[PDB]
C-alpha cells in the first residue's frame, strides 16, 4: 500500500528504485522512462532533478 | 526473538512517537538494530535489549 509519508522517488538507470532514500525494488536496467504527473497540494513548486553521481 | 528485514536478535520492541523521514531500519556503530519503520503507516519502533549490565 502507498504509505502517507512518501517525499521523494529516485529511479536509477540500472533499475533501482529509492523511496525516501531506501532501495525497495530493482527492475531490469532501464533505457527509457515515460511519465505524466500532476498535483495540486505540492505547495508552490515541486522539482524533477536529473542528477549524476559525485563524491 | 525477532527477525526484522533480515536482522535477527533478542529484544523488546516498543512503539515510539518519533518521526524519522528517511530509511527503513537503523543500526548502531557496532551493527546492532536500534529501530525500524512500519512500511504501511510509517510508525517507527525501537528495539532494546532484554537484559542489561548491572553492578
Ligand atoms: C510537502 O509537504 C510539506 C508539509 O507536509 C511541505 O513543507 C512545508 O512547507 C511549508 C510552506 O513553505 C512550510 O510552512 C512548512 O514549515 C513545511 N513543513 C516542514 C518543513 O515540515 C513541503 O514543502 C511539501 N513539499 C513539496 C515538494 O511540495
Ligand atoms: C503496520 O501498520 C499497519 C497499519 O496500522 C498494521 O496493520 C493493522 O493491523 C491491525 C492489527 O491486526 C488491524 O486492526 C488494522 O486494521 C491494520 N491496519 C491496516 C491493515 O491498515 C500492521 O500490523 C503494522 N505492521 C506491524 C508489523 O506491526
Ligand atoms: C510508484 C508509486 C509509488 C511506489 C509504491 C511503493 C509501495 C510501497 C512503498 C514502500 C516504501 C515505504 C517507505 C516508507 C516511507 C516513510 O513512511 O517515510
Ligand atoms: C508518546 O505518545 C503517547 C501516546 O499518545 C503519549 O502518551 C506520550 O506522552 C508521548 N510521548 C512524548 C514524549 O511525546
Q: What does the DSSP assignment read for B11-31?
A: -EEEE------S-SEEE-TTS
Asked whether A12 and A33 are in contact (CB, 8 A), the reply is no
A43 lines ligand 1 (CB under 6 A): yes
Centre of ligand 1 to C-alpha A41, Å, is 10
Among all chains, which residue has been given the C-alpha cell 525497495?
A24
Q: Do the chains contact at A21 and B22, CB–CB below 8 Å?
A: yes
For this entry, resolution in Å reads: 2.5
A46 lines ligand 1 (CB under 6 A): yes
**Which residues numbered 20-49 in B keep a CB inside 8 Å of some CB on A?**
21-24, 39-42
Identify residues after which chain B is interrupted (C–N over 2.5 A): none
A42 lines ligand 1 (CB under 6 A): yes
Experimental approach was cryo-EM
Q: What is the DSSP letter of A29?
A: P
Q: What is the Cα–Cα distance from A18 to A48, expressed in whole angstroms?
A: 14
Q: What is the Cα–Cα distance from A47 to A42, expressed in whole angstroms?
A: 10
Amino acid at each position: 500500500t502507498l504509505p502517507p509519508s512518501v517525499k521523494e522517488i529516485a529511479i536509477s538507470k540500472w533499475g533501482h528504485f529509492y523511496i525516501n532514500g531506501y532501495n525497495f525494488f530493482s527492475t531490469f536496467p532501464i533505457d527509457c522512462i515515460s511519465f505524466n504527473l500532476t498535483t495540486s497540494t505540492s505547495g508552490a513548486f515541486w522539482t524533477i532533478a536529473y542528477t549524476s553521481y559525485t563524491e | 526473538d525477532y527477525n526484522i528485514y533480515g536482522k535477527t536478535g533478542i529484544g523488546i520492541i516498543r512503539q515510539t512517537n518519533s518521526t524519522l523521514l528517511s530509511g527503513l531500519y537503523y543500526t548502531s556503530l557496532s551493527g546492532d538494530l536500534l529501530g525500524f519503520k512500519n512500511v504501511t503507516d510509517g510508525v517507527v519502533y525501537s528495539v532494546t535489549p532484554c537484559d542489561v549490565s548491572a553492578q
